[PDB]
PDB file of N, CA and C in Angstrom:
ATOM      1  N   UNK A  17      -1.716   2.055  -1.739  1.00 32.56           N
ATOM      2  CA  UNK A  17      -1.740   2.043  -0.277  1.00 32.56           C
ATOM      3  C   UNK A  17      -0.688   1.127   0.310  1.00 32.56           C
ATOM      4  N   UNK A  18       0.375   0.766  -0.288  1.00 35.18           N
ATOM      5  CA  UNK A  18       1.225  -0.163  -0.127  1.00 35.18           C
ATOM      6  C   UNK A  18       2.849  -0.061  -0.618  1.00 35.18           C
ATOM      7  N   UNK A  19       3.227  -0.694  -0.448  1.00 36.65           N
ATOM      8  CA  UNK A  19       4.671  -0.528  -1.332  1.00 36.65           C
ATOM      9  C   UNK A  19       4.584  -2.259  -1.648  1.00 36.65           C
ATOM     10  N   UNK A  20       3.912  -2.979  -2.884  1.00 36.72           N
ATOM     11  CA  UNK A  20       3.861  -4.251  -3.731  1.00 36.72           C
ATOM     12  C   UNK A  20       4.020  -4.008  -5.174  1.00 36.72           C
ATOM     13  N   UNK A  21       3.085  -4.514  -6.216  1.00 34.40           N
ATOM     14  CA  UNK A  21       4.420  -4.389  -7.307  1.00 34.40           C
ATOM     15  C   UNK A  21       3.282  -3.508  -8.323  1.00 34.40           C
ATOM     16  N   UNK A  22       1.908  -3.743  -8.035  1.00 34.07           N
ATOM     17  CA  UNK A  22       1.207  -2.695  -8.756  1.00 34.07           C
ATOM     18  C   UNK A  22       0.636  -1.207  -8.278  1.00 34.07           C
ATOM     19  N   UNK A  23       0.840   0.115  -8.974  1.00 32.36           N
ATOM     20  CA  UNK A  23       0.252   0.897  -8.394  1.00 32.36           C
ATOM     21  C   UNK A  23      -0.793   1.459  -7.713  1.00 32.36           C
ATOM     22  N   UNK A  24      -1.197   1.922  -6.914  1.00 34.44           N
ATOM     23  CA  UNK A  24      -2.617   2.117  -6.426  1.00 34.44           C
ATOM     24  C   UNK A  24      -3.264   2.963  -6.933  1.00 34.44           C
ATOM     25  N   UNK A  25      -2.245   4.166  -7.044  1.00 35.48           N
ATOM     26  CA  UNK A  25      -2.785   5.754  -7.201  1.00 35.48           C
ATOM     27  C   UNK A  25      -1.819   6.437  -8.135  1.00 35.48           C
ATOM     28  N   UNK A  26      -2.134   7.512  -8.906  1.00 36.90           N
ATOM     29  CA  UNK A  26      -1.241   8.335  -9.616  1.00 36.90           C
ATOM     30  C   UNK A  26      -0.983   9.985  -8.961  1.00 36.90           C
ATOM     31  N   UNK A  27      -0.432  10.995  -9.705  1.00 38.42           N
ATOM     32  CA  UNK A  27      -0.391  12.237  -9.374  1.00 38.42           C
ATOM     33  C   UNK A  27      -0.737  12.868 -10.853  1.00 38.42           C
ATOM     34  N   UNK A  28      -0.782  14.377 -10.444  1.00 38.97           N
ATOM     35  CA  UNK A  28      -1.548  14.564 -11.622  1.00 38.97           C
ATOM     36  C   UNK A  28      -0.099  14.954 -12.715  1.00 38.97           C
ATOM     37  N   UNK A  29      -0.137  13.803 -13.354  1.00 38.55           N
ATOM     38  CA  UNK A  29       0.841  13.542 -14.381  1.00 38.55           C
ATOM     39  C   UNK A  29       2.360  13.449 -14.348  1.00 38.55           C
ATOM     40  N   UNK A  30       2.773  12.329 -13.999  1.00 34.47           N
ATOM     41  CA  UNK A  30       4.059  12.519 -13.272  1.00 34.47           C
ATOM     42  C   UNK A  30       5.046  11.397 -12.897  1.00 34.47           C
ATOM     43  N   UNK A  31       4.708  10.464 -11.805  1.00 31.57           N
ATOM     44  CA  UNK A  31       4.993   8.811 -11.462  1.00 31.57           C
ATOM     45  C   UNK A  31       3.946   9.150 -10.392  1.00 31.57           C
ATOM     46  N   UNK A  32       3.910   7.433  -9.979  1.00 29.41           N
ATOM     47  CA  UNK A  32       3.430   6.913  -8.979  1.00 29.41           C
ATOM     48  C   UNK A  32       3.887   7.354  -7.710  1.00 29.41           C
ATOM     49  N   UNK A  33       3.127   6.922  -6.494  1.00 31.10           N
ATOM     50  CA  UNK A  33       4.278   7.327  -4.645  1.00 31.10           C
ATOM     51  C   UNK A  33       3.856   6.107  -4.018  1.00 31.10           C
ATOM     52  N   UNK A  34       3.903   4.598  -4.484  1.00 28.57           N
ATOM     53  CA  UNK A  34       3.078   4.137  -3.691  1.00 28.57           C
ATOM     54  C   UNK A  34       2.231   2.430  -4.579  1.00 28.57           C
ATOM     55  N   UNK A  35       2.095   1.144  -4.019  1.00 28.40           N
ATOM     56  CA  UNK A  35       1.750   0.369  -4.948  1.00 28.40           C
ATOM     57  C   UNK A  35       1.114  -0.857  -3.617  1.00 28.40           C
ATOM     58  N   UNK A  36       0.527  -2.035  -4.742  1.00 28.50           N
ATOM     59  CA  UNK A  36      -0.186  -2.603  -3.575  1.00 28.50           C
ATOM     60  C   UNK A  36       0.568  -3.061  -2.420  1.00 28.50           C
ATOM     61  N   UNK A  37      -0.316  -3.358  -1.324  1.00 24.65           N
ATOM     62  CA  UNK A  37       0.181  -4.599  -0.023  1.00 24.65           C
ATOM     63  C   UNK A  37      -0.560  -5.451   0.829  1.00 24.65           C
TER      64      UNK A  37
END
């Protein structure tokens, strides 16, 4: 829900869109 340095969420198999804030 953020753009910080760990991810929040995935897609289904792929990279991340997105990390904490």
């Amino acid at each position: 829900g953020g753009a910080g340095h760990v991810p929040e969420y995935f897609v289904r198999g792929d990279t991340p869109i997105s990390f904490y804030g």
